[PDB]
Every structure is written in C-alpha cells, then in structure tokens.
Design a protein around this ligand. Structure first.
Ligand SMILES: Nc1ncnc2c1ncn2[C@@H]1O[C@@H]2COP(=O)(O)O[C@H]2[C@H]1O
Ligand SMILES: Nc1ncnc2c1ncn2[C@@H]1O[C@@H]2COP(=O)(O)O[C@H]2[C@H]1O
Lengths: 201, 72, 201, 72, 66, 66
DNA sequence: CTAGATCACATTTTAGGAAAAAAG
DNA sequence: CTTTTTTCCTAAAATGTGAT
DNA sequence: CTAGATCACATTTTAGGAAAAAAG
DNA sequence: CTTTTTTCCTAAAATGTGAT
C-alpha cells in the first residue's frame, strides 16, 4: 500500500541476532522500521542492570522518539532479539516524506499511541502488583506475543527466568520461586526455557 | 464457515506435509485448522519447514492454527 | 500561528478545579487541548489506590491516545489540578483537520514522543531506584515544573507527602520519613506543604 | 545584555509595583530580573497581583525572574 | 545599649505594623525587642507579613526578639 | 497378556525407530515394554522424537515402559 | 537481613473567602 | 471611590507516630 | 511483620550446527 | 540426486539453593 512507497525510500540493512540497532545516548538522526525479525527495547541502570522495556516485532518502527525535536539522544538501547532486516531513513528525508503524505505519520504516531498505553500500564504494574502479580501478568502478555506457540493446554513460550526478571523487575531466583509456585497451583507448566501458560484462549 | 468444509488437499501443500497430516488422520481443513503446533510437531516426519509450511498456507487462506470452534 | 486555526475549530469548556475531564474506561471519541490551567493524569488499582502518571499544563493535548484506533477506552483518569479551560474536538473532525494540515498532527505526536520518553524513565525508576532515590528524583522533577517558585536557596514547591506518595509509588509515612531524612542531610527544606529543593539552578 | 542596562521604570508597571521595587532598592531591570519571587513576596505591599504583574512584564520583555548572571 | 533608646517609630516600617505597635504601647525599640514572635502575633491587625517584617528590620539591625 | 505376544513390528511405527528396535533385538512388544525411556535413548539413532514416538503408540495401546 | 507497609487517631496544617486596612 | 494587600477564621485534609 | 535480594558454585539446560538417515 | 528431519555434541549460559 503506502508502506511499499515508504520503504522504497529507505536504505536496508540486516542486523545479526544480538547486535545493537540503537545505542542509548547516541545522536538520534535516523528512523528505523523492522522489515523482518524481532528486537528488544531496554534500558540499563548505573551498575548496568538491564530492564526490558518492550519487545518489538516486524511492522514496528524504532527510534522514532528522536524525530520531533532536533538533536536528542536515543531514549534506550535496542538489541536484535533475532537476526532481522531493518529499513532506515534520515529523520530529514522522513519529514519530507510526510509532507507528501501524512498518512505515514499517522501510522507512526499510531504506534507511539499503543506504546504509551502499554508503557503506562507497565508503570501501574510496578506500582500496584507484587512480583507474583507482575510475573503472573507477564506470562499472560508473553502468551500474547506472535512467536507464542499454540498448545493443547493453552499457550507455550520459551523465555528464561533471568529474562522474566528483567521484564517484571525482580531477581532471577525470585522468578524461579514464583514460577515453581505457579506450577504447583497448576496454572503454568515449566520445562527449562519452555513455559506453558494454561488458560490462554 | 465455507472453507473448513473442503478437504485439506485443497491447500496444495508439499508431499511430505500431506502424507503427514494424511497419516495423522487429518481430512478437512476444519480439523487441521483447529490443531495445535506443538501437536503437529510430534507428528513423525513433520519438521519445522513442513510446520512453517502448514501455517503459511492457512495464513494465506486467512486461517490460523489451533483454531477454536464447537461442533465438528 | 497554526494553533489559532486549530482552536477556532474546537469547542471550549471550563472545568472547575478537582473536576474530571477524562474518565478512564469511557469511550474515547474526543481530543482535548489545555488552554489555561493544569491537570493530572492518573490511574487507580482494584482497591482504588491512585498513582499519578503525569501532570499536564497548558499547551498540552489530552486524551490523544484514543485517536488512532477506532473505539478504544480512555487509558487513564484526568483530574483538573486547578480550574482550567479546555478546547475539545471530535476525533473525526480532528482527523479532517489533519488532512488539510499535518503540521498539527506533527505537533501532537511530538508530545506523545516526550510523554513516552518520560513514562519510560518512570519505568526505569520504579525499576532501579529505591524510595529515597525516587523521592529524591521527583523533588528534582517537581522543581522543574512551571508552577515552581524561584527561591534564594533554589526552587520552592508546594505538594503534600500523600501526593509524592502517589507519584513515586510508596506510602505517605515513608515519604515523610525520607523527607525528614533529606532535610537533615540538608538537601531540601520542608515547612508543611512547602518544600524547597536546594541545588536547583 | 542590552536590556538589563536601562532602569526598571522602562517596564511601565503599576504604581504600587514601582513604589515597591523602588523602596526595595531596585534600580535596573538587571537587578530585579535576578531576584527570587519568594523574596519579592516578602516585600511589603507587593502582593500576588503585583508579583504576577512583575513576572508578566519581564516575560513579555523576554526575561525571567530570579535570573542568574555574574558580575553586576 | 544606645539603640534601645531610640523609638520603634525611628525604625520606620509599614503603616499597618506601625499603628499596631503604636496603639499597642510600643514606643522604643526596647519595648519591642522585649517581646517574642508569639507575643505580637496576638496583636490585632498584626499577622504573618507584619511579624515577618518587624523581624527583617531588626535582622540587619543586629536585633532579635527576646 | 495376549498383546505382549505380538511383535514390536506388528506395532508399525517409524522407519528410524523400527531399524533401531530391529537391530537392537527387540522383536515382540514384550521385549520392548520391558525397557524404560533411558534404556533406549542410549540406542544409536534413537532419540527424543523416537522415544517420544515409541511412547505415544503404547499410549493409546494401554502399555507403558517398565 | 534489609527496605517498606502498617494502623488508628490525636494534633497540625491547609484552603480559600470575608472583611478590615492600607494604597492609589 | 476602587484595588490590592493582610489578617483572620474553620471545616476538611494531611501528618506523625514506632514497634512488629 | 512481610516481601524480596542475596551470594557462590556445582549441576542442569540450551543454542545451534555437523552429519546420519529417512523421504521424495 | 536433493530436502528435510533427527540425532548427537559441547562451549556457554541459566539455575537452584536457603538461611540471614
Ligand atoms: N517505552 C517504550 N516502549 C517501546 N519502545 C520504546 C520505548 N522507549 C523507547 N522505545 C524505542 O526505543 C528507541 C530508542 O531510541 P529513540 O529515542 O530514537 O526511539 C525509541 C523507541 O523506538
Ligand atoms: N503515560 C502517560 N503520560 C502522560 N499522559 C498520559 C499517559 N497515559 C495517559 N495519558 C493521558 O491521559 C489520557 C487518558 O485518555 P486517552 O487514552 O484518551 O489519552 C490519555 C493521555 O492524554
């Protein structure tokens, strides 16, 4: 549709799994769009403890925040969850593109809209729920994601405890615990990195 | 719905895939359609390529896998 | 500038202090813009414990999130911090307005950009810092706000402990504590609702 | 800067205000300009209206209150 | 001390506080400094800004209230 | 039991697992059910899907591995 | 082992508006 | 006379307390 | 008083790629 | 012959542990 047009103006680059697309702190001058693949938005603290802010899959834009105000820094790091193809565009050229057609901007903003909603919910969670609560919630969310696997007893997902730690913001041990706990309570199944959240569907 | 009526073959998928659903007793796209990936994966001789295949054809035909629907 | 144009198409209403502009959960069909006044974006939990998500002053848009996807619910409550004038517009009519001029959309998105950045930082805070840390940080942030008062020893602000509680997400007692603590450490001054964060400027 | 040179009067503000900065020893907009609200509030006979006044004129003239600048 | 000889009046303050001290029988900066904050706050028409004012003059005037 | 008389072969499984049991000297569903999971996993060319397969046939076939 | 939540209530502080009192 | 500043007042809201 | 962080390390699990082995 | 599935293998990463 419009997208074809948009892309035809982007440069395209492949990023190998685990590589860094956006490096928090750098001058934001380009806009990215995920053609194929998945990636992880995350921020670290002084020591370096990471916190997963969000997972973005194909169709998503990345590093959009720099676009509206001239000369800002990337708001957070973005690591390639898997190997993935990415379309890039100078914020400049992109603005030009918008003049000829805001439909595209509409599309972009539309994502930020979503992203705000959720990140906001993220805040309320760290605010109101407890680890069991948050972990509980996330298993639901991860079950939502695309790479989720349809399973007889619900949804199946692969993700480490360390990871869920960085998602919900608690220790990896504590995740293991709350995880065994949820298994007793027969709510999820857990075999290594493979977890199955019953109840989905 | 109209599609789930016609049999799987209409999906024009690879031999391997066919012979697999075939041997797994799948007849109509209405059965397959409501089958879990994890299951199909246990299916002998049905691997990632074949699985990814099934999903993609169902995806084009507008369907999903592990579909939900009562009375079949 | 453009804004004059934009407003000329909005209906205008005055909201008395403490009134509710947006009621989380309701059908989002209108976009708002703050002409005069301040307001507070906040969300509650099951019990009803509120959590201040953000403070928006004049110039800000409100209830923009509903605009891109048809038929969603308001993402959170928005209470009038003070009495304030608000311009309103059907999302419909607003879209039309954008066709004739995306400049306006540009402006709107531009805010969401900002809002995401911060709300994201909000997450990292609940994630990495401790109450003293977060409270520490917020006193800085509140010092930033417009209604802040220039003071010889820095910035002066009026805000209750209960409030800071709902901001940083901890108990009101604990705020009082960490607050006395910061006063001993001679970092801030506190007389009732009036606090002065030294060091600003 | 050029503005902070001329005296406060150029601000064409209300009597009350004037007589107040006046009695508070303020001469050039360069002094006032770098004065804290909280201070001006202690100034007798200078109230919210008058204070809000000062800020607004400085705001139009492009200046702020409690300004910072060395050597004056 | 030599200053405590001088009248409150010679201090020049604010009409309001003036009339207060005045009709309160506080004629010399002595009578004044003899009182504490709480003392005058009870004085009619004398309040926050007033007290705070009366304080700030004796501030740079090397005199407190006690 | 009457089924344990029948050969593994009569069970029909998967070429791979077949040749395994076969060249592993497992001719009757008896010889088979006598072994546990760990037992066959050590069998060359017999692994995860294999074992998992051999299990699922005896699943609806009222037979376990012990 | 540490960092906060807690809980009832007596006590302190605030909002904000009438009205006296200066100022212009 | 009119404005703006100050004082003055109280129902209602905020606060501290401190060991488990 | 409660809810989590902790800490080192022996032990378990995973990624992902060669290559054997079926299938077409 | 060519593809796809399965097994098989290990450096590297994830995990549990449990009283303070
Ligand atoms: N809260 C968030 N949710 C989703 N994506 C985000 C969030 N914060 C940052 N990002 C993305 O990460 C990018 C980091 O650099 P930018 O600020 O250019 O743009 C940012 C967004 O694309
Ligand atoms: N994280 C946030 N930061 C700032 N404003 C927000 C945030 N979340 C919600 N809002 C505002 O609150 C509004 C609630 O309703 P809407 O979803 O229509 O639009 C929302 C935004 O205008």
């Amino acid at each position: 549709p419009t997208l074809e047009w948009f892309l035809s103006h982007c440069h395209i680059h492949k990023y190998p799994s685990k590589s860094t697309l956006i490096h928090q702190g750098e001058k934001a001058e380009t806009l990215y769009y995920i053609v194929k693949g998945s990636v992880a938005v995350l921020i670290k603290d002084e020591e370096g403890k990471e916190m997963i802010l969000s997972y973005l899959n194909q169709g998503d834009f990345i590093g959009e925040l720099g676009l509206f105000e001239e000369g800002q820094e990337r708001s957070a790091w973005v690591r390639a969850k898997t190997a993935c193809e990415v379309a890039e565009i100078s914020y400049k050229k992109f603005r030009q593109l918008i003049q000829v057609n805001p439909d595209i901007l509409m599309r972009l903003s539309a994502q930020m809209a979503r992203r705000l909603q959720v990140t906001s919910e993220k805040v309320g969670n760290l605010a109101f729920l407890d680890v069991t609560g948050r972990i509980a919630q996330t298993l639901l969310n991860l079950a939502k994601q695309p790479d989720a696997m349809t399973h007889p007893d619900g949804m199946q997902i692969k993700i480490t405890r360390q990871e869920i730690g960085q998602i919900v913001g608690c220790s990896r041990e504590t995740v293991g615990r709350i995880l065994k706990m949820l298994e007793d309570q027969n709510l999820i199944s857990a075999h290594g990195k493979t977890i199955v959240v019953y109840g989905t569907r | 719905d109209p599609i789930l009526l016609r049999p799987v073959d209409d999906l024009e998928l690879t031999v391997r895939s066919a012979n697999c659903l075939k041997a797994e007793a799948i007849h109509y796209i209405g059965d397959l359609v409501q089958r879990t990936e994890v299951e199909l994966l246990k299916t002998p001789n049905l691997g990632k390529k074949s699985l990814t295949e099934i999903k993609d054809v169902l995806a084009s035909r507008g369907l999903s896998l592990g579909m939900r629907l009562e009375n079949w």
